[PDB]
Design a binder for this molecule. Structure first.
Ligand code: CL
Lengths: 113, 108
């Protein structure tokens, strides 16, 4: 079987730390993702892993329904010939990686207006 | 806090320990990944750890960073492995033999 949808997922290929040349690039990715999520079910945690070779972005939505909507809105885009992929993370694993994501309930909004 | 040393987590569970060579294969898998980057000079699969911890030391921090950046977030045995750097002294105290270990490890 495939892992059930959870509140939490990991995006890949969102970027390539070797090629990323713009200052504040990871924040723009963060804003881009939140903006995308706020067209759907929002998001309560996000983390762009600047050092990951596969360009990982971690996300947690206020509900699995919100998470599904975000994943479905995000996993379609392409970057640098590589396609973005989402993988759900079980709560304990995601919570172990991101302890603070456990009690975070506030919907995030983008920095840029 | 990049160092020569890191702790992989979620590499296994007590259920993983029921197959022979589970630890030898995990050991080999990490070495293999490290030898695609900067290699590795010490590894310890902590059979007694509940969190499926594997301890690793690379010949240089450049090597470890390359390994960690390749390993963290990576999926292994259906579980997302996470790498957390281990302070060098901590690693050496936990693992005395890793200090003078300079021979690049190769798989079994
Ligand atoms: Cl997992």
């Amino acid at each position: 079987v495939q892992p059930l949808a959870t509140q939490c997922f990991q995006l890949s290929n969102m970027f390539n730390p070797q090629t990323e040349e713009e200052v504040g690039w990871d924040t723009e990715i963060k804003d881009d993702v939140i903006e995308e999520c706020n067209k759907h079910g929002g998001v309560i945690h996000i983390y762009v892993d600047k050092n990951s070779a596969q360009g990982n972005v971690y996300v947690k939505c206020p509900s699995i329904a919100a998470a599904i909507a975000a994943v479905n809105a995000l996993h379609g885009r392409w970057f640098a010939g590589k396609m973005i992929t989402a993988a759900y993370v079980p709560l304990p694993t995601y919570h172990n990686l991101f302890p603070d994501s456990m009690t975070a309930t506030q919907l995030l909004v983008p920095s840029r207006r």
